[PDB]
C-alpha cells in the first residue's frame, strides 16, 4: 500500500515545474538530483512522512482532511490538506505567498509510487521505487 521506504528513481518534467515555481537554474539541477527518500507510516487517519534528501531531513505529519502547513524543499510555504480519494492520496494546496493552487497526487503503480504535481498549467512527476 503506501507503507514503507521509497527512493526517487526518475522524474518527468520536473525542471520545468521548478522553473514555473521561480527556482533558479542551479537550484533546479540540484533539486532534480536530491536523492529524495520517503519513509511513510500511518497511524489511523494520521500519516508521518519522513523526508530525507540532500537538502533536509524533516518529518511531515498530517491528519487526512485536516489543513496543515508544509514547505517545499526550496522554501516555498504551502497550506492545505491531504485526503484519500479511492486509493490515491490527493493533496490540495495553496502557496501562502501568491495564493495559487498546487495539486499533488500520490498513487501506487505496480510497485512504484508516482507523485504528480500540477501548478499553473505545468505537470511534473517524481517516481519512486520501493526500498
From Swiss-Prot:
Pfam name, any one: Lipocalin
Residue sites binding tetradecanoate per the record: 82, 106
CC per GO annotation: apical cortex; cytosol; microvillus; nucleus
Annotated hexadecanoate binding sites: 82, 106
Location in the cell: Cytoplasm
GO molecular function: fatty acid binding; long-chain fatty acid binding; long-chain fatty acid transmembrane transporter activity
Keywords from the UniProt entry: Acetylation, Cytoplasm, Lipid-binding, Transport
Result when mutating residue 86 to V: No reduction in stability, impaired ligand binding
Effect of residue 110 to V: Small reduction in stability, impaired ligand binding
Effect of residue 75 to V: Reduced stability
Tissue expr: Expressed in the small intestine. Expression in the mucosal cells of the ileum extends from the midvillar region to the villus tips.
Gene Ontology biological process: fatty acid metabolic process; fatty acid transport; intestinal absorption; intestinal lipid absorption; long-chain fatty acid transport
Entry's induction text: By peptide YY.
N-acetylalanine modifications at: 1
Membership in a protein family: Belongs to the calycin superfamily. Fatty-acid binding protein (FABP) family.
Domain observations: Forms a beta-barrel structure that accommodates the hydrophobic ligand in its interior.
Stated role: FABPs are thought to play a role in the intracellular transport of long-chain fatty acids and their acyl-CoA esters. FABP2 is probably involved in triglyceride-rich lipoprotein synthesis. Binds saturated long-chain fatty acids with a high affinity, but binds with a lower affinity to unsaturated long-chain fatty acids. FABP2 may also help maintain energy homeostasis by functioning as a lipid sensor.
Protein name: Fatty acid-binding protein, intestinal
Taxonomic source organism: Rattus norvegicus
Amino acid at each position: 500500500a503506501f507503507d514503507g521506504t521509497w527512493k526517487v528513481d526518475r522524474n518527468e518534467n520536473y525542471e520545468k515545474f521548478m522553473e514555473k515555481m521561480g527556482i533558479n537554474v542551479v537550484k533546479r539541477k540540484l533539486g532534480a538530483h536530491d536523492n529524495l527518500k520517503l519513509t511513510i507510516t500511518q497511524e489511523g487517519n494520521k500519516f508521518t512522512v519522513k523526508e530525507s534528501s540532500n537538502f533536509r531531513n524533516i518529518d511531515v505529519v498530517f491528519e487526512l482532511g485536516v489543513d496543515f502547513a508544509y514547505s517545499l524543499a526550496d522554501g516555498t510555504e504551502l497550506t492545505g490538506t491531504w485526503t484519500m480519494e479511492g486509493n490515491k492520496l490527493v493533496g490540495k494546496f495553496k502557496r501562502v505567498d501568491n495564493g495559487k493552487e498546487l495539486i499533488a497526487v500520490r498513487e501506487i503503480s505496480g510497485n512504484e509510487l508516482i507523485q504528480t504535481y500540477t501548478y499553473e498549467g505545468v505537470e511534473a512527476k517524481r517516481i519512486f521505487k520501493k526500498e
